[PDB]
Design an enzyme around this catalytic site. Structure first.
Site, PDB file in Angstrom:
ATOM      1  N   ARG A   6      -3.455   3.215  -2.600  1.00 36.25           N
ATOM      2  CA  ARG A   6      -3.933   1.993  -3.256  1.00 36.25           C
ATOM      3  C   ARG A   6      -3.097   0.838  -2.860  1.00 36.25           C
ATOM      4  NH1 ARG A   6      -1.538   4.147  -7.600  1.00 36.25           N
ATOM      5  NH2 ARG A   6      -2.147   6.023  -6.463  1.00 36.25           N
ATOM      6  N   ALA A  17       0.827  -1.204   0.000  1.00 33.54           N
ATOM      7  CA  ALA A  17       0.000   0.000   0.000  1.00 33.54           C
ATOM      8  C   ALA A  17       0.854   1.243   0.000  1.00 33.54           C
ATOM      9  CB  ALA A  17      -0.892   0.019   1.232  1.00 33.54           C
ATOM     10  N   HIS A  18       0.495   2.193  -0.830  1.00 34.93           N
ATOM     11  CA  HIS A  18       1.169   3.480  -0.836  1.00 34.93           C
ATOM     12  C   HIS A  18       0.300   4.446  -1.580  1.00 34.93           C
ATOM     13  CE1 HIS A  18       2.235   1.479  -4.611  1.00 34.93           C
ATOM     14  NE2 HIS A  18       2.271   2.697  -5.122  1.00 34.93           N
ATOM     15  N   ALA A  19       0.666   5.731  -1.553  1.00 34.17           N
ATOM     16  CA  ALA A  19       0.005   6.703  -2.388  1.00 34.17           C
ATOM     17  C   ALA A  19       1.017   7.346  -3.253  1.00 34.17           C
ATOM     18  CB  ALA A  19      -0.700   7.773  -1.570  1.00 34.17           C
TER      19      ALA A  19
END
Ligand code: TYD
Ligand code: TYD
Lengths: 133, 130
Positions: A98, A51-53
């Site tokens: 996401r 998960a990261h943005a």
């Protein structure tokens, strides 16, 4: 679903007896200029991605084969989305967290990106993501 | 031959899979103005042969295999594409025939220009002349 910066693109294939063809052009099917195309293959349902943005990076995701779930998060709302066909594109716009998971074994994901790769643009702390919203 | 090169694409491999990335004027010698892909293919139904004057392309066999027969006006070559970490750069003024798709194979094309219906040179003699 209440997430602002994403959209399902139900793409138009041209089909004949030779196969199906789908095409995407800058600022047309894709709401940006393509700087980068990348693809992920040899995937495994036991090995999700992190998960990261991103901030300014936009993408369109197409499951070229097999399937996966994308959990999108806009800071406020979250939504799980199954990609499982090559004629659907998932637009992921600016300021989105996401996480991609449950790839069917050997599934293949095509990604069209608005900008060049930059490891520094990954935001891995969720609270940092919130702050910059 | 001529305006054409097999690209050994660098992949990142880890326990989640393999990733390959191609970027404008790096892996691809142009600005990618268009991406398309062909799937649901069949070894019985080859694509028509044709040339383009100015379009450059990079082809990547995302799954399965096919044969691309390249023709530069003087010479010809068959190239079997069958793996996703290889690209075929097809530069300008090239006649090509794609055929022999394994059933359901999938081909990714990165293109230097927007799709143009009347930019196909479908006659070989006409190709030769120009
Ligand atoms: C998206 C992308 C990733 N990568 C690299 C970074 C990673 O080692 C690997 C997988 O990307 P990714 O899963 O996006 O990042 P991370 O593994 O850091 O969570 O590919 C590129 O080289 N180019 C790219 O365009
Ligand atoms: C390459 C391409 C083809 N197409 C369409 C035109 C054709 O009807 C179909 C297949 O194209 P293609 O096989 O290149 O041309 P032809 O069918 O004339 O041999 O897909 C696009 O819409 N956009 C594109 O970028």
């Amino acid at each position: 679903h209440m997430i602002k910066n994403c959209k399902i693109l139900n793409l138009r294939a041209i089909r004949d007896n030779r196969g199906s063809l789908i095409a995407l052009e800058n600022n047309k099917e894709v709401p940006f200029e393509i700087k980068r195309v990348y693809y992920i293959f040899d995937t495994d349902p036991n090995f999700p991605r992190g998960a990261h943005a991103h901030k300014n990076l936009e993408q369109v995701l197409i499951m070229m084969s097999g399937s996966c779930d994308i959990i999108l998060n806009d800071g406020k709302n979250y939504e799980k989305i199954c990609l499982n066909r090559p004629d659907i594109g998932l637009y992921i716009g600016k300021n989105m967290w996401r996480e991609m998971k449950n790839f069917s074994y050997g599934a293949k994901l095509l990604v069209l990106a608005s900008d060049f790769y930059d490891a520094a643009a990954y935001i891995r702390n969720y609270d940092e993501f919130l702050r910059n919203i």
